[PDB]
Amino acid sequence: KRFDSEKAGDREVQRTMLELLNQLDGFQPNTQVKVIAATNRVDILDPALLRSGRLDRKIEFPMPNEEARARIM
Amino acid sequence: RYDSRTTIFSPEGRLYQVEYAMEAIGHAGTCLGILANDGVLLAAERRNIHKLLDEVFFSEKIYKLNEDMACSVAGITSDANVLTNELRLIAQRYLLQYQEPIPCEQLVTALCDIKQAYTQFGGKRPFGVSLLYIGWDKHYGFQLYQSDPSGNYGGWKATCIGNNSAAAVSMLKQDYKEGEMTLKSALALAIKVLNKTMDVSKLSAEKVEIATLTRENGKTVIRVLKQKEVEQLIKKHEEEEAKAEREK
Amino acid sequence: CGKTMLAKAVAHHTTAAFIRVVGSEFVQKYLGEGPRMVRDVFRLAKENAPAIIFIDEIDAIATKRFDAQT
Amino acid sequence: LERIKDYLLMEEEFIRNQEQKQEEERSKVDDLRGTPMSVGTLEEIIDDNHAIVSTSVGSEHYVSILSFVDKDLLEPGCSVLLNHKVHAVIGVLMDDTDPLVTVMKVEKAPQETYADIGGLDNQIQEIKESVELPLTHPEYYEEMGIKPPKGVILYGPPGTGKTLLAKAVANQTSATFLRVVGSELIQKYLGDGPKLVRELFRVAEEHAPSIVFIDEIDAIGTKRYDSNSGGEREIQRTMLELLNQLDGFDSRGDVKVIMATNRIETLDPALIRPGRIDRKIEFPLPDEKTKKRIFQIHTSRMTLADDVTLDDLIMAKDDLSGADIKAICTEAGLMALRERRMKVTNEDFKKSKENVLYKKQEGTPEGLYL
Amino acid sequence: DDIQQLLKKINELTGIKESDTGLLAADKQTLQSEQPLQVARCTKIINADSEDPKYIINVKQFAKFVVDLSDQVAPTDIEEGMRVGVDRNKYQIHIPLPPKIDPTVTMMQVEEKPDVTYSDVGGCKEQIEKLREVVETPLLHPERFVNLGIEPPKGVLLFGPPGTGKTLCARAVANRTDACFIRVIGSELVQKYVGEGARMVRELFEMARTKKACLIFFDEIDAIGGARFDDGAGGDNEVQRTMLELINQLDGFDPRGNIKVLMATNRPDTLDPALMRPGRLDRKIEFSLPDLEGRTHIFKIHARSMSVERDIRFELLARLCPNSTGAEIRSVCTEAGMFAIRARRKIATEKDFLEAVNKVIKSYAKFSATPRYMTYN
Amino acid sequence: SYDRAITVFSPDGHLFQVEYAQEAVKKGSTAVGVRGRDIVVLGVEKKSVAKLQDERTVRKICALDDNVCMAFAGLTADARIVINRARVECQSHRLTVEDPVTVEYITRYIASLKQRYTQSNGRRPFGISALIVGFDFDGTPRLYQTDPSGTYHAWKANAIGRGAKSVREFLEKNYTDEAIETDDLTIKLVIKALLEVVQSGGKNIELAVMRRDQSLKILNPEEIEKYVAEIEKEKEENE
Amino acid sequence: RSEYDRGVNTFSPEGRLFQVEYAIEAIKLGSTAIGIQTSEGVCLAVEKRITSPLMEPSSIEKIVEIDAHIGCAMSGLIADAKTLIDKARVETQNHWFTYNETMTVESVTQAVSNLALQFGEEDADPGAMSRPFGVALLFGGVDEKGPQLFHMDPSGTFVQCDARAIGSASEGAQSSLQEVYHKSMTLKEAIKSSLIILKQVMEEKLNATNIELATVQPGQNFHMFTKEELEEVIKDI
Numbered sequence A: 001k002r003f004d005s006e007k008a009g010d011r012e013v014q015r016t017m018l019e020l021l022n023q024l025d026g027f028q029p030n031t032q033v034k035v036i037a038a039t040n041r042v043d044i045l046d047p048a049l050l051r052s053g054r055l056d057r058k059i060e061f062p063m064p065n066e067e068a069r070a071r072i073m
Numbered sequence B: 001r002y003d004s005r006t007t008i009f010s011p012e013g014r015l016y017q018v019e020y021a022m023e024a025i026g027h028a029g030t031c032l033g034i035l036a037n038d039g040v041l042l043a044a045e046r047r048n049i050h051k052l053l054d055e056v057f058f059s060e061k062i063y064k065l066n067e068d069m070a071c072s073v074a075g076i077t078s079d080a081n082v083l084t085n086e087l088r089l090i091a092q093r094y095l096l097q098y099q100e101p102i103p104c105e106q107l108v109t110a111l112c113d114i115k116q117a118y119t120q121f122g123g124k125r126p127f128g129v130s131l132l133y134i135g136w137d138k139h140y141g142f143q144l145y146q147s148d149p150s151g152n153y154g155g156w157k158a159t160c161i162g163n164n165s166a167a168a169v170s171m172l173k174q175d176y177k178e179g180e181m182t183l184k185s186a187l188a189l190a191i192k193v194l195n196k197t198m199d200v201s202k203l204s205a206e207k208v209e210i211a212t213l214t215r216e217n218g219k220t221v222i223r224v225l226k227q228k229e230v231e232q233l234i235k236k237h238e239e240e241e242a243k244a245e246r247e248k
Numbered sequence C: 001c002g003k004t005m006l007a008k009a010v011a012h013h014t015t016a017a018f019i020r021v022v023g024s025e026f027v028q029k030y031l032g033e034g035p036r037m038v039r040d041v042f043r044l045a046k047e048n049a050p051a052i053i054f055i056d057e058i059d060a061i062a063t064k065r066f067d068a069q070t
Numbered sequence D: 001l002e003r004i005k006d007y008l009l010m011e012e013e014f015i016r017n018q019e020q021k022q023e024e025e026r027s028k029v030d031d032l033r034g035t036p037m038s039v040g041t042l043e044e045i046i047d048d049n050h051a052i053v054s055t056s057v058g059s060e061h062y063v064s065i066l067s068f069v070d071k072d073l074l075e076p077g078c079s080v081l082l083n084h085k086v087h088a089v090i091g092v093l094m095d096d097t098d099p100l101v102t103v104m105k106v107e108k109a110p111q112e113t114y115a116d117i118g119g120l121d122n123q124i125q126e127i128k129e130s131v132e133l134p135l136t137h138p139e140y141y142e143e144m145g146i147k148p149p150k151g152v153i154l155y156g157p158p159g160t161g162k163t164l165l166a167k168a169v170a171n172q173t174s175a176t177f178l179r180v181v182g183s184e185l186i187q188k189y190l191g192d193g194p195k196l197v198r199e200l201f202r203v204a205e206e207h208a209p210s211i212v213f214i215d216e217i218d219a220i221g222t223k224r225y226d227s228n229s230g231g232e233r234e235i236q237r238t239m240l241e242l243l244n245q246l247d248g249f250d251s252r253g254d255v256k257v258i259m260a261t262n263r264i265e266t267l268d269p270a271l272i273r274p275g276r277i278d279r280k281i282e283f284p285l286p287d288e289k290t291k292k293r294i295f296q297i298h299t300s301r302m303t304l305a306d307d308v309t310l311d312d313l314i315m316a317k318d319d320l321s322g323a324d325i326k327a328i329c330t331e332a333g334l335m336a337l338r339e340r341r342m343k344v345t346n347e348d349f350k351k352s353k354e355n356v357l358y359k360k361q362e363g364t365p366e367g368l369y370l
Numbered sequence E: 001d002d003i004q005q006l007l008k009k010i011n012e013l014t015g016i017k018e019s020d021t022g023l024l025a026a027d028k029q030t031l032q033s034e035q036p037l038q039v040a041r042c043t044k045i046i047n048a049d050s051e052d053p054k055y056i057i058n059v060k061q062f063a064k065f066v067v068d069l070s071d072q073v074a075p076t077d078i079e080e081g082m083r084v085g086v087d088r089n090k091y092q093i094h095i096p097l098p099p100k101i102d103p104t105v106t107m108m109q110v111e112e113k114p115d116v117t118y119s120d121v122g123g124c125k126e127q128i129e130k131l132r133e134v135v136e137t138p139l140l141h142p143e144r145f146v147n148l149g150i151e152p153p154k155g156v157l158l159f160g161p162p163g164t165g166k167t168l169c170a171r172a173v174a175n176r177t178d179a180c181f182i183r184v185i186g187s188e189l190v191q192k193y194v195g196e197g198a199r200m201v202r203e204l205f206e207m208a209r210t211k212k213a214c215l216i217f218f219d220e221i222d223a224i225g226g227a228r229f230d231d232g233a234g235g236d237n238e239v240q241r242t243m244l245e246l247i248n249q250l251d252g253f254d255p256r257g258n259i260k261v262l263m264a265t266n267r268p269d270t271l272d273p274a275l276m277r278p279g280r281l282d283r284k285i286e287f288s289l290p291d292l293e294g295r296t297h298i299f300k301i302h303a304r305s306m307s308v309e310r311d312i313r314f315e316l317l318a319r320l321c322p323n324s325t326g327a328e329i330r331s332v333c334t335e336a337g338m339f340a341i342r343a344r345r346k347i348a349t350e351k352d353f354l355e356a357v358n359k360v361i362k363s364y365a366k367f368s369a370t371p372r373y374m375t376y377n
Numbered sequence F: 001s002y003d004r005a006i007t008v009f010s011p012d013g014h015l016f017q018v019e020y021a022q023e024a025v026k027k028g029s030t031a032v033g034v035r036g037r038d039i040v041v042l043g044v045e046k047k048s049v050a051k052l053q054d055e056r057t058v059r060k061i062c063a064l065d066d067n068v069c070m071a072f073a074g075l076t077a078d079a080r081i082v083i084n085r086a087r088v089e090c091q092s093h094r095l096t097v098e099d100p101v102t103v104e105y106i107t108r109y110i111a112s113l114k115q116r117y118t119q120s121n122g123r124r125p126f127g128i129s130a131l132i133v134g135f136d137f138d139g140t141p142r143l144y145q146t147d148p149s150g151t152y153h154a155w156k157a158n159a160i161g162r163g164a165k166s167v168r169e170f171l172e173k174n175y176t177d178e179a180i181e182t183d184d185l186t187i188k189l190v191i192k193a194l195l196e197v198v199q200s201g202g203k204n205i206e207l208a209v210m211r212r213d214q215s216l217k218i219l220n221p222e223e224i225e226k227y228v229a230e231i232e233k234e235k236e237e238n239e
Numbered sequence G: 001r002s003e004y005d006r007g008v009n010t011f012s013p014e015g016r017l018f019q020v021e022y023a024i025e026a027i028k029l030g031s032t033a034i035g036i037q038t039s040e041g042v043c044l045a046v047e048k049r050i051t052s053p054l055m056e057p058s059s060i061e062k063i064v065e066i067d068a069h070i071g072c073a074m075s076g077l078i079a080d081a082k083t084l085i086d087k088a089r090v091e092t093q094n095h096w097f098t099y100n101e102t103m104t105v106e107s108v109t110q111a112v113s114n115l116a117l118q119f120g121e122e123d124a125d126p127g128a129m130s131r132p133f134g135v136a137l138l139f140g141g142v143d144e145k146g147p148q149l150f151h152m153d154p155s156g157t158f159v160q161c162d163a164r165a166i167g168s169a170s171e172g173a174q175s176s177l178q179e180v181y182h183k184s185m186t187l188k189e190a191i192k193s194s195l196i197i198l199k200q201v202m203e204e205k206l207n208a209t210n211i212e213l214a215t216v217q218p219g220q221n222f223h224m225f226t227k228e229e230l231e232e233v234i235k236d237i
Ligand SMILES: Nc1ncnc2c1ncn2[C@@H]1O[C@H](COP(=O)(O)OP(=O)(O)OP(=O)(O)O)[C@@H](O)[C@H]1O
Pocket: C001, C002, C003, C004, C005, C006
């Protein structure tokens, strides 16, 4: 989540996040390049990264079901 | 932490809920009594005086409990009404069973055991009422008593419970004389103690309620002094202060 | 009931440096930020005429760098 | 008027402290060294004598070393000294610890031995066996097979003079004493503060036998509670570094730790464990016999009337701390000076106790109830 | 006052003494040649070009410099992605520079071996056995695991009450590891610059990768940002990045490969969920308060050095210790010797320990250990 | 586990709320008891006169029946309830069995009442540790004490309340077969033990004596003073 | 633990019952009691652990008589043991009253266990025994079957034991018992064995005041208060 720390802050990390947003927003209309991203927690992610089309695809991974667990083992 | 249930005991063996209730009695009208040789007296502060309130009810903090006993109540108003009824009931119940007026210490012990029970049982909060008992019994003569929300009771030649109790107790300890109280002198001690404890200036008659219990012709004659009787005592205290002027 | 319309009016009719300085505005994250506001007023009052402060928007504190120990 | 001799002794001592080159070899080194020399880290060592040196500007050029006294002391992480312009290693690496660490070292202890303290004799015995005794007679511990206890915690109510025991240890200790408050690790920068804890310990090891006092340890380590709001104290990281130094891999060599807390329950269990605090010392509020010795010690260097009854003050009032006793003695002297009497009457002591104990109000209705 | 004068006279005598007291070829020819010798500041090459190479180098904070090779150099010797030294005045790569050692990461490696045998640790045979097949047997004899086609856990978390013995076991593994042991300084990983510590964690893995089969001991994992609240204030943002960098390098997109990670925490609950998740740390070896057989063994090992009567019963002493950590049992043995020293008896007796058992446990404000309640008998 | 809840246990195995009740007993005024060949005696302390307060109402030593008397240490009101219930049982035992209550029975009854409060929530364990001293039928003198935990024990001599431990240590050295030799010597042993923890007040003692053939009598203040003076003379003779 | 120990009503995610385990812990606070069952009879030995010289030794009852043929030893809360001991005493007499015969040791152990089981039935005497009892009882008696020793536990679980130990030092005592116990042991041999084990596992020296011994054998009755023979047996050993 963009830090609201006043004055001194981890400004560089926010700049990196903005750079990814700059490429995602109004750019790469060609579908030749696609990006897959993963997070243990989606809560930390800013609403901006998802935006409307910047990262529209969502692939929720559910905890394994009983049938799935037998197969996974 | 160790609050809420009267049942929980703190790591220092302290029942905080009972202690809180005993501290709570402080926010109440001052009630004081003097043993007085040849008499006994109860004096109270009539707080919450307003022009609209009628004050039609005879008394307000002073309730008789028997032909030969009386009490003054300081505490939660509702709890007081519950306790006064039970004290009146215990007094008649003893008379029905033994056909003799209840000895004063016993009426106090019985209410105190009821108050004590509330502290030992989880469901109820400890009573928030503390009261002073004035009466005459053949076994031990004129007596004065104090009850606590904890359920503990004591007999005091003089004591005070509501508002600035410590100030009255300090004034009473110095002024009181053992065996020389002589009722009329005890009434003066009360007016002087009341003036100090009450922040009220001039101790007007409406603010003070005085009840005196005496044994006349073999019959206890509990009487609540009328406003005119209270007024003369106040004027005498004011005149005594005028005599004190210059000399002091 | 008209207290703040009067408060703003005093600022309009004042010849003093009436920086209304509602409690929270240009104020930064701080603990006990009452000094920063008053110190500015003393200097400005000295520069021109005694300055006047109106206390409103009193959310100057409750900042991110804030919280009692427990 | 013997004060003049004492004042002269102090001035003479300061003068003594104030009063505390080779014909060709030194002059050549003086020419070789620059007028300004900048000290920087050594990153890499090369046999050619041109060794990479890291600097604040990060110029890591290999630089030749020509040290007349010795050039074999070069090591990784050593702070080498370089010429301002040429940047060549001038000579033997500078060897000074960080400034914040230097302040802690104490060379002079104002208090004397355990004599000033009275009635904490059991507490004195424990501190001595852990601190003074192992150094004085190392053979006893080896014969028993015991390794001497290295850590002590002094926990007591306010004014029981836990610090006085520490001042007494400073008076009679072979070991260098580093006096650091627990609240002296507030470094704002992320990092640095845990590193400062490492710095204090490395200096203690350098000085060989050393005693570390950490008064008010409650601030540095308490509870080890979770981040919660997310402020993240970073104090927990600092405490963890102290926990690592006391018993976290490696060894503590010969360093002894004395720590003092008004409240011991708040302190986190890991810090207060055998291996970090082998011996625990408790200072209780003084009783009667302990009070008698303290009252005598405080009044020993003042005029005392025969009328004054020291026993009466001690027995009549119970709860006064050792510090409270000293305050009564200072207040009593002031009470007498008001009447212009240098000598102190019994009446003055009685008035003094009342004035000192006016802020201590305790208890509620717990009288009739029990 | 005369005695004070004697000291003042002594000081005056010292003052008189101080005032009265007042009344290699390297420094030769080599210096004359050395002062002219030029410097070559270190820089890192990123690229090379055809014809004139025009290698472009970032100094380390200065700029991308298009520097031609120096006249007295071999073009093949200069390489892309190689540290080099460029003279400022001649603006050319006079000499190439060897790759940076990064010594602080090298320092964390134990190098020395702690002299503690597994025998000294006592009362935790099961905890030792679990560590043996994630630390010693997979490395010493990988063939057995391969025969069942079973991979080693490659990760271990030691958690327990403080003083249980988690670190003591770890030093014992270091004694017989026969592979690089890398103790990690938790404070070192936190750094003033943003993500400077995260760079170090990459270096930690890189050093681990270069050595063949190594165990990394992250003691006090809580210090290494072992939590991920990651609140909006982001006070721990720099450390949180350092923690995530450790997690990814530990596992995901090619993991440790030959690295076994041992992590020890007094509070396991605080550790962040991603680190707790297995694969990063498959085994969860929790150390536990020792049982009566363990309590006797810890007493026997600690007391073997101390001189004592041969008839002492450790079983009784261990029974008297209802729930004692190994450190507290060691504290009883040392305290028992201290009581004998106080009475000046060279050989201690069973009674001395019983006094210590009261002192170490009951005398401490456990409250349960000291009984004033008749309640139960 | 949890301290707050009479019935929750602890991982160590302790009902802490019951132990917290024992604290109220310690804060109570010291009371001592001795078993004499014919004069079981109990001593009390802290008369703590309050100036304008009558002391007939304060009754730390309360008789339960003719052959048995009791001294309570702890919350005053809780003690009043236990004493009255014990008094009713003593009379009931006579109605159910026409024989006077043996001292053990009344201590077992007091223990059972105390245990019943401990067993369930909604009730507070009683904060008293009464000492019961009496002579049973057949003329055997006996002393028993009851803890707030509901346990009961028989003691040759014991102390309860503030500074009980100090009095017991004094009795451990002082209590001897000789000391119980004479009725006065037994009264003296209680006075000497009580004096140690009673401060220098001396007047703040109310020792009561059971003749074991007659009735409980509270000793006169003057009579108590005479014994105190006799003890001082004996101490001077030893010097 | 980690919560779910608030009541016997709650069940652990593991399925364990906390509070019942906590009551099992309370027995450890108790002094060790050792019981050995032999063909000649059952021997019970206990550590009196007298707190003070002044307190009367008889008032601490560690070995009690349930009936002439049955004796019991208790380690754990004193008050809890009393409620269970009274039930066993009423039950043995009630079984005599209804069936004119001596109750078997196993049946008394079963009857006592039935009250112990009601930690929270929610039907029986509501407002009573809301928590598990904290006392482990060793019942040693000679019945029609022969000498029998039975151990009950706070959870209502009872078992016949040739030799058993309860209380603090029970674990140490059991290990010693497995080595010492044999089927042919005489009661006299068992009595010496029990005190020898008790001496090793008790910090105080095994003087006659420290140890209380009890023996029930078919020919005699309870005879479970050896008196002054406590001195005789100890001196011979
Ligand atoms: N004296 C007035 N003459 C004309 N309009 C007025 C007057 N007083 C108030 N009003 C009107 O009422 C509105 C409310 O005033 P205002 O918001 O200042 O009230 P307030 O009680 O001071 O509340 P707050 O402190 O929240 O601002 C004004 O903006 C204006 O429209």
